[PDB]
Design a protein around this motif. Sequence first.
Motif, short mmCIF file in Angstrom:
data_model
loop_
_atom_site.label_atom_id
_atom_site.label_comp_id
_atom_site.label_asym_id
_atom_site.label_seq_id
_atom_site.Cartn_x
_atom_site.Cartn_y
_atom_site.Cartn_z
N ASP A 65 0.86 -1.19 0.00
CA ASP A 65 0.00 0.00 0.00
C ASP A 65 0.89 1.24 0.00
O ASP A 65 2.05 1.16 0.39
CB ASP A 65 -0.89 0.05 1.25
N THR A 66 0.34 2.36 -0.42
CA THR A 66 1.05 3.63 -0.45
C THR A 66 0.31 4.67 0.39
O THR A 66 -0.89 4.88 0.20
CB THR A 66 1.13 4.14 -1.89
N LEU A 67 0.98 5.32 1.33
CA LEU A 67 0.32 6.38 2.09
C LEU A 67 0.56 7.72 1.41
O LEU A 67 -0.31 8.56 1.40
CB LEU A 67 0.82 6.43 3.53
N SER A 68 1.75 7.92 0.86
CA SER A 68 2.04 9.17 0.15
C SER A 68 3.29 8.93 -0.64
O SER A 68 4.10 8.07 -0.29
CB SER A 68 2.25 10.35 1.10
N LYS A 69 3.46 9.65 -1.73
CA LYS A 69 4.59 9.38 -2.60
C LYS A 69 4.90 10.59 -3.46
O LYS A 69 4.03 11.10 -4.15
CB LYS A 69 4.26 8.17 -3.48
N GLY A 70 6.14 11.07 -3.39
CA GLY A 70 6.62 12.10 -4.29
C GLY A 70 7.96 11.70 -4.89
O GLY A 70 8.35 10.54 -4.85
N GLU A 71 8.68 12.67 -5.42
CA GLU A 71 9.93 12.39 -6.13
C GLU A 71 11.04 11.96 -5.17
O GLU A 71 11.94 11.23 -5.56
CB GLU A 71 10.39 13.65 -6.89
N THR A 72 11.00 12.41 -3.92
CA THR A 72 12.08 12.04 -2.99
C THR A 72 11.64 11.29 -1.73
O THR A 72 12.49 10.68 -1.08
CB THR A 72 12.91 13.26 -2.56
N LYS A 73 10.36 11.32 -1.39
CA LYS A 73 9.89 10.57 -0.21
C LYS A 73 8.70 9.67 -0.47
O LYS A 73 7.65 10.11 -0.97
CB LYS A 73 9.55 11.52 0.93
N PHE A 74 8.86 8.39 -0.13
CA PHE A 74 7.77 7.43 -0.20
C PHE A 74 7.43 7.01 1.22
O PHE A 74 8.32 6.61 1.99
CB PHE A 74 8.16 6.19 -1.00
N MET A 75 6.15 7.08 1.56
CA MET A 75 5.68 6.53 2.82
C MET A 75 4.58 5.51 2.55
O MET A 75 3.56 5.84 1.95
CB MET A 75 5.16 7.63 3.71
N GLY A 76 4.77 4.28 3.02
CA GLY A 76 3.79 3.25 2.76
C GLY A 76 3.85 2.05 3.65
O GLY A 76 4.26 2.14 4.81
N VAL A 77 3.49 0.91 3.07
CA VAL A 77 3.27 -0.31 3.80
C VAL A 77 3.94 -1.49 3.09
O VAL A 77 3.87 -1.62 1.85
CB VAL A 77 1.76 -0.57 3.86
N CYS A 78 4.57 -2.36 3.86
CA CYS A 78 5.15 -3.58 3.30
C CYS A 78 4.86 -4.79 4.17
O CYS A 78 4.32 -4.66 5.30
CB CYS A 78 6.66 -3.43 3.14
N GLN A 79 5.24 -5.97 3.66
CA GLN A 79 4.97 -7.25 4.33
C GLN A 79 5.97 -8.33 3.89
O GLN A 79 6.18 -8.51 2.70
CB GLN A 79 3.56 -7.75 4.00
N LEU A 80 6.62 -8.98 4.85
CA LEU A 80 7.44 -10.14 4.54
C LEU A 80 6.57 -11.26 3.97
O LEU A 80 5.42 -11.38 4.36
CB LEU A 80 8.12 -10.64 5.81
N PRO A 81 7.12 -12.06 3.02
CA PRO A 81 6.41 -13.23 2.48
C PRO A 81 6.40 -14.33 3.50
O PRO A 81 7.36 -14.46 4.25
CB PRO A 81 7.24 -13.65 1.25
N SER A 82 5.32 -15.09 3.57
CA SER A 82 5.24 -16.16 4.54
C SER A 82 5.31 -17.47 3.77
O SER A 82 5.26 -17.46 2.55
CB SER A 82 3.96 -16.06 5.34
N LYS A 83 5.44 -18.59 4.48
CA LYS A 83 5.60 -19.90 3.84
C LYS A 83 4.27 -20.65 3.71
O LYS A 83 3.26 -20.22 4.22
CB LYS A 83 6.60 -20.75 4.64
N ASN A 84 4.30 -21.77 2.99
CA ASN A 84 3.14 -22.64 2.90
C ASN A 84 2.57 -22.95 4.28
O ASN A 84 3.31 -23.34 5.18
CB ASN A 84 3.50 -23.93 2.16
N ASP A 85 1.25 -22.75 4.42
CA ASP A 85 0.50 -23.06 5.64
C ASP A 85 0.79 -22.08 6.79
O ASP A 85 0.13 -22.12 7.82
CB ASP A 85 0.81 -24.49 6.12
N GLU A 86 1.77 -21.22 6.61
CA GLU A 86 2.23 -20.39 7.73
C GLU A 86 1.41 -19.09 7.83
O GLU A 86 1.00 -18.52 6.81
CB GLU A 86 3.73 -20.18 7.53
N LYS A 87 1.09 -18.67 9.05
CA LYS A 87 0.29 -17.46 9.22
C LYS A 87 1.07 -16.28 8.62
O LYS A 87 2.30 -16.25 8.64
CB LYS A 87 -0.04 -17.21 10.68
N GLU A 88 0.36 -15.31 8.06
CA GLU A 88 1.03 -14.17 7.45
C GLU A 88 1.72 -13.26 8.48
O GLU A 88 1.26 -13.10 9.60
CB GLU A 88 0.06 -13.35 6.62
#
Length: 326
Positions: free
Chosen positions: A217-240
């Motif tokens: 997801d993106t909260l705000s974004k310009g030419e020099t600053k990005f503020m947003g959201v990320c998430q590590l990938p999880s494994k098979n059957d594993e909770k996110e």
Amino acid sequence: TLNGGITDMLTELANFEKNVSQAIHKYNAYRKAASVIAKYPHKIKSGAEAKKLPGVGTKIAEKIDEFLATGKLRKLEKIRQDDTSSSINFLTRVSGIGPSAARKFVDEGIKTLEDLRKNEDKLNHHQRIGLKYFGDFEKRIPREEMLQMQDIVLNEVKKVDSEYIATVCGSFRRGAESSGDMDVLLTHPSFTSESTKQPKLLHQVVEQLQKVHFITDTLSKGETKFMGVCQLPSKNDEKEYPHRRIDIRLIPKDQYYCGVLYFTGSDIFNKNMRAHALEKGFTINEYTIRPLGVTGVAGEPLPVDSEKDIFDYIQWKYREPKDRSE
DNA sequence: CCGACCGCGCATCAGC
DNA sequence: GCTGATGCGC
DNA sequence: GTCGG
Ligand SMILES: Nc1nc2c(ncn2[C@H]2C[C@H](O)[C@@H](COP(=O)(O)OP(=O)(O)[C@H](Cl)P(=O)(O)O)O2)c(=O)[nH]1
Ligand SMILES: [Cl-]
Ligand SMILES: [Cl-]
Ligand SMILES: [Cl-]
Ligand SMILES: [Cl-]
Ligand SMILES: [Cl-]
Ligand SMILES: [Mg+2]
Ligand code: NA
Ligand code: NA
Ligand code: NA
């Protein structure tokens, strides 16, 4: 935790003043007191002892005496009982809802997570993403996760252009065993104080990280600053994994040291250091350190080849990142 | 007393 | 549209 | 709310 009771109390007061009183200077005053006490290497036995510390004055010393005698503060007890105050303080915990929006919402009778969720149309984009991940954004990030996240961000940036250098800053660079979020400073030789020789430098890195489903997801974004959201990938059957806040700042390459100084923090450290700078007749931002003229108008950028040159200009012994956690 | 309190990017708005 | 002020967050 | 000048 040595004077945890007192520092918690001061932070709660800081929060009140920021969120409810919208009194930013009092908020900083309390935060500074909390900082200096947290650093203090003895269990405080009295207000008088605390008032010795810079930042602690008559009023906070009185408060400390009450707290030490009773284990609490009547001023805070009442605040906790006040619905308007409690409500406003709560709503500001959503990213994108600050003091004013919080107070405005409370006037519209929007007071609880429930209310927000049934009034999503009253929220701007950032606020909607803040509500979506409300719970997630309260969780800290273990360092071991920051290390996995680092590895992803660094590798993905390398795939975009091997000339990018991405540096994880914030509490991570200060050696913290967990972090509230991830802060990434980015440079590329084509972006300097003299020229932007290449467009979309930040965009391309953001695209690649969305491409691999790291940025969600993106909260705000310009030419020099990005503020947003990320998430590590999880494994098979594993909770996110929880979703996490991420900020990426693209700094001109020749201004790396001022940029990494700024983004390593802490925020209070930066405020203290910039204030001392002013006392010494310089001003520091994330780009440059400059002299304050005869008038107090900034002069030209001074040369900087290391973080320590910055400390040197203002006559401070160098402090390693890990000792900048105030 | 009495300011002066760090410095700035992006989103959003009001007023032209 | 633009500039400037304000909110929010870093 | 605190502090320097
Ligand atoms: N000059 C200045 N720099 C600031 C300020 N706020 C933040 N920064 C700089 C200084 C700060 O270190 C950096 C990232 O901000 P983040 O809010 O993530 O702070 P972390 O230290 O990472 C925080 Cl302990 P965690 O994220 O682990 O929970 O931005 C500010 O008010 N002023
Ligand atoms: Cl204030
Ligand atoms: Cl209390
Ligand atoms: Cl620099
Ligand atoms: Cl500058
Ligand atoms: Cl360190
Ligand atoms: Mg951080
Ligand atoms: Na003091
Ligand atoms: Na908020
Ligand atoms: Na951050």
